[model samples]
Structure formats: C-alpha cells, structure tokens
Target: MQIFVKTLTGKTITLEVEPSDTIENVKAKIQDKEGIAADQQRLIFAGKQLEDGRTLSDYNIQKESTLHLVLRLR
Candidate 1:
C-alpha cells in the first residue's frame, strides 16, 4: 500500500510499503528518499511512537494513512 508521511515541518513524502513492513524498514525507505538516517527518525502513528520491531499492520496502518515523522537531531 502507498501512504503519506508528514514531517514535523509539514512536508509530506509519499511512501510505498506493505502492511507487513516493519517500522525499521519504513525508516530505511525514509533514509533513502528523504536523506534522514533510520536511527535519527522518530515515527508516530495513531498518537504513539512506532516501535522499530513492529509491523505497520500491527498498528492498523492502511492505505493513505499519514504517519508523522520527527527527526532526532543531536
């Protein structure tokens, strides 16, 4: 499924993923397309921090779901 990830700055990036994809995997794609390191990313879905070991389906993320992204800087 394809979804939109919105950065804290309000920039949206289109992401292609599967329900079985892990948060870490999504972060990897973000790193490739957005130039943000996986470790530097903090993902929030449904008002909670997305865990690296969890799959998107675990959180019920569906097509067109908007994930909030916060990049850790330090």
Candidate 2:
C-alpha cells in the first residue's frame, strides 16, 4: 500500500510498503527520502511519537493518509 508523507522541508513523498510493514520501516523510508538516518528522523502522527513496532493498521492508517515526518538536524 502507498501512503502520503509530508516533510517539514515542504517535500511531499509517497512511499509504498506492504501491510506487514512496521512504522519503523516507514520511518526508515522517510529517512531515505529526506537524506537522514532512521535515528535522525522523528515521525509523529496525531501528535504522538508513533511506537516503533506499531503497524499502519495499528494506527488505522489508510492509503493516502498523511503522515508528518520531522527531521532532527541537531
């Protein structure tokens, strides 16, 4: 499935992942697109630090859902 992601840098990136993918996987993917490490990326959804092991389904995220990816440049 594909999901919509918007970075603080004003870049919108769409990523495709399987249903079995975890939130961490998505974070890594965002990191790849944002030119940062997984550790350097802080992904938030609905005003929370999404659990690492949580799946998209766990968050009830549907296709085209917008996820906010924040970068930690420090």
Candidate 3:
C-alpha cells in the first residue's frame, strides 16, 4: 500500500509499503528515504497510534491512506 506521511514541521512524504509490513518497517523506510539514522518514532492513522510489531493491515490501513509521523527524541 502507498501512504502519505506528514513529517514533523517539514513536508508530506510518499512511502510505498507492504500490507504485511509493520509500522516499524515503515519507520525504517522514512529513515532511509530521509537519509536519517535509526531513531524512535511513531505513526498515527485515524487517531490510532501505529505500533512497531503491528502489520499495516493491523491498523486497518487503506491504500493511499495518510499516516501522521513524529519522532521521539532522546
């Protein structure tokens, strides 16, 4: 599935993800696409925070859906 990630005070990014991919995996995509290093983060969809181990479908995600993104600073 393709989703949009509204970056924190930045821009919206388009990410291609698999239905079985976890939210953590999507986070990794963000890291790679943005050339960022490993960091803690979370994504929200329909007001539900996406978890690390949950699959994209686990969050009831849809094609071309939007995901809210934010980083967790140390």
Candidate 4:
C-alpha cells in the first residue's frame, strides 16, 4: 500500500508500505526519511491516534491514505 504523511511544516512524505506493517514500523521509516524519532512522533489517521502494535490493515488504512504526523517538543 502507498501512504502519505502530512507534517505541520507543510511537507508531505510518501511511503510504500504493506497492509501487514505495524504502526511502529511506519514510524521508524519516517524517522529514517525525515530524521524524526519514533518516540517523538504521534501518527494519526482520520483524526484517531494510531497504535504502535496495530497493523495498517487493522486500522483499515488503504492505498493513498494520508496520515498526520505530529512531532513532540523535546
């Protein structure tokens, strides 16, 4: 599946992911691509907070879905 992430900075991040991929896995990839740590990220899909252990499919995240990524202050 392909997903898009929206950051407050107005940058959109595109990623190719599997439906079986966990939220934590996605966060790690975001960290690699954007240099934002997983622990400091809060990923939301459709206004609901995502869980690290949950798979993308579990949240019904489909192709081209856009997720919101909020970075916590240090």
Candidate 5:
C-alpha cells in the first residue's frame, strides 16, 4: 500500500512498500534517502507510535495515509 511519510523537518515522502515491511524498515529507507538514523526515528501514526514490526493495516493505514516522522529524542 502507499503511505505518506512526513518528516518533522517538513519533508514529505511517499513510498509504496508492502504490509510486511516493518516500521524499522521504513525508518531505514527514510534514513537512506533523508540521512537520518534509524535508532533516532519515531513514527507517529494516528497520533500514536508506529511500533516496530507493525503492519500498515494494523494502524488501519490506507492510500495517502499520513504519518509523522520525528527524532526519537531521549
């Protein structure tokens, strides 16, 4: 499915990854493209943390689904 990933820095990236892809995978992909660290990433989906190993469907994600990616400070 297509997911809308918006970084805290105001950059938006759209990716067509599979439901099998873990939250960590998405973070790593973003790191590859945006130069961020996977360990330092926190994903906010529907106002909650997109916990690692969660499928997109778990969060009821869909096309154009928007999520916030921010530095996992602390």
Candidate 6:
C-alpha cells in the first residue's frame, strides 16, 4: 500500500509500504528522506497517535491515506 505523509514543514511524500510495516519503519524512511530522526517524530493517522510496534494495517491505513508528522523540539 502507498500512503501520503505530510511533515511539519509542509513537505509531503508518498511511501510504499506493506501491511506489516511498523510505524517505526515508516519513521526511519522519513528520517532518510527528510533527515528527521525517529525519536523526534510523532506520527498521527486518523487523528490518533501511531504506535511504533503497530503495523500500518493495524491502523487501517489505506492507499493515499495521509499521515501527519510532527517534529518534537530539541
């Protein structure tokens, strides 16, 4: 499945992921693409905070679904 993610700085990216992919895995990819560390990110989907151990499918994240990425202050 492919999902769209929007960063705090207004950057958007489409990510190709599997149902079993963890939110932490997505964060690592975001880190590679946006240079934001996983520890600094808070991912929200469907108005709920995503758990690192939970899979995308666990949250029912679908194609083109938007995930909000908020970066915590240092």
- Candidate with maximal lDDT: 4
Question: Over the stretch 6-73, how does candidate 2's per-residue lDDT look in tens digits?
Answer: 88778889999876688889988877776778877777767767777988888877777788888677
Candidate lDDT values, in order:
0.92, 0.80, 0.83, 0.94, 0.83, 0.91
TM-score of 6: 0.93
**Residue-wise C-alpha lDDT for candidate 3, range 7-73, written one tens digit per residue:** 7777898988888998878888988877655466768899998888899998889899989887777
Worst 10 residues of 5 by lDDT: 55-64
lDDT of 6: 0.91
Query: What lDDT score is found at residue 35 in candidate 4?
Result: 95
Taking the tens digit of each residue's C-alpha lDDT, what string does model 5 give over 1-74?
78888987788988888877788788888888788888998889888888878877777777788989888668
Segments of candidate 4 deviating more than 4 angstroms: none
Model 5's TM-score against the true structure: 0.86
TM-score per candidate, chains pooled: 0.93, 0.83, 0.87, 0.95, 0.86, 0.93
Clashing pairs in 3: none
Which residue pairs in candidate 5 have backbone atoms (N, alpha carbon, C) closer than 3 angstroms, thus clashing? Answer: none
Per-residue alpha-carbon lDDT of candidate 4 for residues 1-74, written as tens digits (9 for 90 to 100): 89999998999999999999999999999999999989999999998899999999999999999999997777
- The TM-score-based order of candidates, best leading, equals 4, 6, 1, 3, 5, 2
lDDT of 1 by residue, 1-74 (tens): 99889987778999999999999999999989888889999999889899999999999999999999998887
Higher lDDT: candidate 1 or 3? 1
Model 6 lDDT, residue 63, Cα: 84
1-74: candidate 6 lDDT, tens digit per residue? 89989986788988989888999999999988888889999999989999999999999998889999997877
